[PDB]
Design a protein around this ligand. Structure first.
Ligand SMILES: [Cl-]
Ligand SMILES: [Cl-]
Ligand SMILES: [Mg+2]
Ligand SMILES: [Mg+2]
Ligand SMILES: [Mg+2]
Ligand SMILES: [Mg+2]
Ligand SMILES: [Mg+2]
Ligand SMILES: [Mg+2]
Ligand SMILES: [Mg+2]
Ligand SMILES: [Mg+2]
Ligand SMILES: [Mg+2]
Ligand SMILES: [Mg+2]
Ligand SMILES: [Mg+2]
Ligand SMILES: [Mg+2]
Ligand SMILES: [Mg+2]
Ligand SMILES: [Mg+2]
Ligand SMILES: [Mg+2]
Ligand SMILES: [Mg+2]
Ligand SMILES: [Mg+2]
Ligand SMILES: [Mg+2]
Ligand SMILES: [Mg+2]
Ligand SMILES: [Mg+2]
Ligand SMILES: [Mg+2]
Ligand SMILES: [Mg+2]
Ligand SMILES: [Mg+2]
Ligand SMILES: [Mg+2]
Ligand SMILES: [Mg+2]
Ligand SMILES: [Mg+2]
Ligand SMILES: [Mg+2]
Ligand SMILES: [Mg+2]
Ligand SMILES: [Zn+2]
Lengths: 159, 102, 204, 55
RNA sequence: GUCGAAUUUGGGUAUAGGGGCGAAAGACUAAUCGAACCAUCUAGUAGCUGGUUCCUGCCGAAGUUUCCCUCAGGAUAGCAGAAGCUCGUAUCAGUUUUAUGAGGUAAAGCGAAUGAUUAGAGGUUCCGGGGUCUUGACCUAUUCUCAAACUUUAAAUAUGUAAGAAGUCCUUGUUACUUAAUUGAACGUGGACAUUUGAAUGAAGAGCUUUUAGUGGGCCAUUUUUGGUAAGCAGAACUGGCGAUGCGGGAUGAACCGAACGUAGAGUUAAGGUGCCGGAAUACACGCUCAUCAGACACCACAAAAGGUGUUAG
RNA sequence: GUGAUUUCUGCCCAGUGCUCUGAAUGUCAAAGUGAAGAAAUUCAACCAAGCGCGGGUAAACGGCGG
RNA sequence: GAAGACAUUGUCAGGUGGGGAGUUUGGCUGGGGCGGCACAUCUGUUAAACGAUAACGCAGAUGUCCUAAGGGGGGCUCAUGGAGAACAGAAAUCUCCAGUAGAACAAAAGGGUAAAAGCCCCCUUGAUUUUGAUUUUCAGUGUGAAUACAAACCAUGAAAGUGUGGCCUAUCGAUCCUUUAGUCCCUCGGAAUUUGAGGCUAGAGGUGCCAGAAAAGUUACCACAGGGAUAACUGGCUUGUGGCAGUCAAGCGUUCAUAGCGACAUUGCUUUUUGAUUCUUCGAUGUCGGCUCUUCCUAUCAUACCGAAGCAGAAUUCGGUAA
RNA sequence: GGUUGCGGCCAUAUCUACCAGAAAGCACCGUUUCCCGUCCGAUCAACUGUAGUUAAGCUGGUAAGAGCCUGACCGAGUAGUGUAGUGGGUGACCAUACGCGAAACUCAGGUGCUGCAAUCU
């Protein structure tokens, strides 16, 4: 018959990295998590307690609870035709801070500095990101850069 | 499996409310009274003509029974029940395993 | 009792090698892969001729054995026993299955061995002297009739079985950078300890 | 008489007729599953600050 | 066949339905017998077969999930209709971009681990066996070839989160939690910053509730893919279709190509075509081919290995 | 049950049935008897046939290997 | 005359009782049956790098085992190889060196682990009490298993800490009924006491067809509702198998590959074999062979005309045009 | 800059073979009454800093070193792959169009950085 155990099909997902087995470095335990922080889930194979289920591998959530050696994370899971809210109790070895907003908070700080700086001089502070634009006109010189002619090569085997 | 005849565990006897010494024995069912309401109803239904009126189980599948231990507090005589996993051989005596010899 | 080769010509299944899950597998029909003067030095046989596959298919171990005998017999008779070094460049590691008598429980039993070859993959290689080019070419040509699909005969520009062009091999040899060890050679690198690279290649 | 065993054909198309609803977000999410020791003190903290603003 | 008897036969009489009668065939018991006929219970029950009566308008499916002595049936969720309700620039999206995660398949690798595997060469023994020197064993440096249940490395396509007012910053209130400690945690008072207010595009507006129909036999095509010699065979993955669909094209065809349909007129096209049937150039241009079984257009209604001083080009 | 006459009908009683002027302290109903209890009731002893044990039986059912 | 409180008859009780009555006598399934369990589950793979994903796909496993093989702490380091030591040798015990785990960790497999999760030693029962939340299968029901806390009581350690069974991924069970533990609480409805009975909370006795009816055969005497959702004929797809035909040429043929043959290999054709499949027909297409009669195919046995030979003649052999 | 205690990242830090090391520190080293632990004061415990030594540990340097790390229009826009056609081919497969894009290989460079406290020609 078929087999659908809790850790089914996790042969490679829960392995350690190459030449990265052994004990967990101490910086994992020294990090501080607060309610509202955004974290991403990646299970560690050497810690069998507080281990997430394989579905939540690679998912990102928000902390809602803090305990002694673990935190509570909220995950939106799509079941059928709608998303359902999932709550996970994970030890700190299996999570880390998500950098998906640490580079966004600095833009918030930059916007405020730029808005205040131009307040005294110029209107239209222009604090919106823009996609890559088409290139402008330019002049290419041939001084020391005379074009070199290329032609297709004949067929050879060289085996 | 082997289980010691004595055990130190919690006792909710309203006087201990703490870990005490307990004697350990093996639970046995006990004889079924013929004046229990379920028995009185069954005997009435069986009388007269019509034959057997209730199912009689036949397709036995289990080979073992779960062991239940009765724990009596030595202080207040309060009892408690614990259920262990299924096993084919159970004993309450001593004869602990020896670490290593011939 | 053996099915026609057309039943197992194409690579329709994943590789199914002998292993601890297969176990009971019959032996391959071809056991010898090096023929002729296999002890000859690299300098003796500069010319190399290849029989190159031109299709993505499977070659049975029976076909490899039959082609090996045909090629070796002709070259030996015309050129001589020690005038070439013939090497089979494909090994049959794929186990074929056959279902023997409806379709209930149809998983088959091992039937034979075959080699899965790609487009442009070398099948046979022969090294010999330059004067023997015609003989070895005719020997490889006669071996094509034993194989399904299309094969091409290509005159290699490498020196013998080495991965170097003829001018490159000559330049290394005159500089004392080539040392003989059996039928192949060893080269000198600019890396490693001087203590090891001096005792070897003293001429350089 | 054997029949079909399983397939997911047409199931995504059914899901996209009305479904794939992004979950709605509420201010003040429920405190279910939060540490009970935190909740006991936070209840007293809320009661005390009520009197400060009321008075 | 038998024909003087265990013979043939009229009439009278006896045995009645789970009963009779049987030199025995489950035979016979009023054309009815492996349980007669008649009326009633009785319009017996049926997950099974058949049928089910006027028009127009709008919307419009499912053969999938879980459970069931469930497998020709139900319950349950989904898909559908109807009734609306709260509001209305509002947040949203089968999409992209930017920032930041997750993966172990394609490929690749084996003088990298594990497991297979060809060939020599140089060494090693009071530690294999013959012979006074070989063959096996391991050692070291090389060499050929491999892996759905091997691997250091490792894509493409898919996939999680974020891109602000429920935001950011400054000041300081509550608590029985926490700290050596007004330390921190959580929730707040007051103050400062408006919609180039924090990427792109779009948005027959968004959000929400009740109720109920049918369905729960599917099948086909491209790509990925398992069993099988193979099948118009059996079984999965994503998408698009048929079923439920006419119309132009493929002579003909449920699924292919084009395109989806209120009633008409005019114009222009798609796929496919323009010797005649047949609407439209027996148009233009450069070559190739002669076949005593030429050839002629995707799905598609078949042809191979191997050959020819036929002819053409290289 | 076998199926005129003639001739002949062998061996097996472990199994399944049938049968016995066999055995005794196995198993055992209601009633009755004894004990305990304030009673409902509980417990124990005794205990018919049958079964079990023992013997007979194949022109009873049937069997007649390595 | 016989017989006698015994037979007899009446009411309960035990045995016997297919003579008779009623009923039952799983499912999946390349038809059904037999076999197997793909029926409740676990590991790896098939699975196409989130998750999900089928077949009677591939290789295996589960209905157990453990007072330690559970919990805490300490000390220690394994497999193997090399060099040595009376008896002693390939393997006994002792010493050193090298040793990333090539060992070990109850079991199937995959993960995980080195001053440990392995080995040895010491101390222990947290494998405990109360009731909630969460994850997996999922309808976001149950059951099983698992995760993180709160409130108690404990174990261990100098301590930080760790511990709510087994390093992780499987090792199991509703209603009704019976029984036990707890609370000694609620009720027996005219009012009380005492037995008995009935409730409240938590376990055990089991349903393996594992969301859980109590169940033997036969029909060749047979019946009904249906089914081409499904087997026993043709026809269709396929051609393994059967049959027929090529290519290559090691050899056979006194010499000589190919007059006539031809190994090891390899490419096809046919539907006059048999399988595979289940599309058409179960409100029916009459089912083996022979007899009779017509026509068609050529892969030609004979007849006509030819080529070739190891064709002197005769006879025969190979091939062509030809039904 | 040297050294010690406690660390962070966890080989640019490891491994092999050699050489060097002032001052201080660390270490080896001396002893067995006491607490304590062993077959053995070797390990562990205690006492002295006295009797000795940089021999080793430790630190640094050296090697066309092994390993590891980084980069490269080195290989290679190759393998593979998303999307498209009434494209080629009997088939097996392949070419082209709009996109994404490896690994091995080759070569070059590199061989720990750093936080808190204390101390030293
Ligand atoms: Cl479908
Ligand atoms: Cl009558
Ligand atoms: Mg009765
Ligand atoms: Mg097979
Ligand atoms: Mg179905
Ligand atoms: Mg009969
Ligand atoms: Mg009649
Ligand atoms: Mg009716
Ligand atoms: Mg519509
Ligand atoms: Mg029907
Ligand atoms: Mg995988
Ligand atoms: Mg591959
Ligand atoms: Mg139906
Ligand atoms: Mg229909
Ligand atoms: Mg056509
Ligand atoms: Mg016309
Ligand atoms: Mg007689
Ligand atoms: Mg009577
Ligand atoms: Mg009966
Ligand atoms: Mg069935
Ligand atoms: Mg997946
Ligand atoms: Mg353990
Ligand atoms: Mg555990
Ligand atoms: Mg079930
Ligand atoms: Mg059919
Ligand atoms: Mg054949
Ligand atoms: Mg079908
Ligand atoms: Mg007819
Ligand atoms: Mg008819
Ligand atoms: Mg198209
Ligand atoms: Zn007590």
């Amino acid at each position: 018959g078929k087999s659908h155990g809790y850790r089914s099909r996790t042969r490679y997902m829960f392995q350690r990295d190459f030449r990265k087995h052994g004990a967990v470095h101490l910086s994992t335990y020294l990090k501080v998590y607060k309610v509202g922080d955004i974290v991403d889930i990646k299970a560690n194979g050497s810690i069998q307690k507080g281990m997430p289920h394989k579905f939540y591998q690679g998912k990102t959530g928000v902390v809602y609870n803090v305990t002694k050696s673990s935190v509570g994370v909220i995950i939106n899971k799509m079941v059928g035709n709608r998303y359902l809210e999932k709550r996970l109790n994970l030890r700190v070895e299996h999570i880390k801070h998500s950098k998906c907003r640490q580079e966004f908070l600095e833009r918030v700080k930059a916007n405020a500095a730029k808005r205040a700086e131009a307040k005294a001089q110029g209107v239209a502070v222009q604090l919106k990101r823009q996609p890559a634009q088409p290139r402008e006109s330019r002049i290419v010189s041939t001084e020391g850069n005379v074009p070199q002619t290329l032609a297709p090569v004949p067929y050879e085997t060289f085996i | 499996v082997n289980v010691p005849k004595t055990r130190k565990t919690y006792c909710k006897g309203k006087t201990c409310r703490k870990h005490t010494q307990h004697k350990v024995t093996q639970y046995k069912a006990g004889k079924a009274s013929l004046f229990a309401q379920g028995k009185r109803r069954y005997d009435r239904k069986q009388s007269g003509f019509g034959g057997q009126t209730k199912p009689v189980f036949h397709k036995k599948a289990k080979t073992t029974k779960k062991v239940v231990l009765r724990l009596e507090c030595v202080k207040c005589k309060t009892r408690a029940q614990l259920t262990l996993k299924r096993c084919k051989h159970f004993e309450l005596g001593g004869e602990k395993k020896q670490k290593g010899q011939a | 009792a053996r099915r026609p080769a057309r039943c197992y010509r194409y690579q329709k299944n994943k590789p199914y090698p002998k292993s601890r899950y297969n176990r009971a597998v019959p032996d391959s029909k071809i056991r010898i892969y090096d023929l002729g003067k296999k002890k000859a030095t690299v300098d003796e046989f500069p010319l190399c001729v290849h029989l190159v596959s031109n299709e993505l298919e499977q070659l049975s171990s029976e076909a490899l054995e039959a082609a090996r005998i045909c090629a070796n017999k002709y070259m030996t008779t015309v050129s001589g026993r020690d005038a070439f070094h013939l090497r089979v460049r494909v090994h049959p590691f794929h186990v074929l299955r056959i279902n023997k008598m409806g379709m209930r429980g149809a998983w088959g039993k091992p039937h034979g061995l075959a080699a899965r070859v790609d487009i442009g993959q070398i099948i046979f290689s022969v090294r010999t002297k330059d004067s023997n080019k015609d003989v070895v070419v005719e020997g490889l040509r006669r071996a094509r009739y034993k194989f399904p699909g299309q094969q091409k005969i290509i005159l290699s520009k490498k020196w013998g079985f080495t991965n170097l062009d003829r001018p490159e091999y000559l330049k290394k040899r005159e500089a004392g950078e080539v040392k003989d060890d059996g039928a192949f050679v060893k080269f000198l690198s600019k890396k490693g300890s001087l203590e090891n690279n001096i005792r070897e290649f003293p001429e350089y | 008489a054997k029949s079909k065993n399983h397939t997911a054909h047409n199931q995504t198309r059914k899901a996209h007729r009305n479904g794939i609803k992004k979950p709605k977000t509420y201010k003040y999410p429920s405190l279910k599953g939060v540490d009970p020791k935190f909740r006991r003190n936070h209840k007293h903290a809320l009661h005390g600050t009520a009197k400060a603003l009321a008075a």
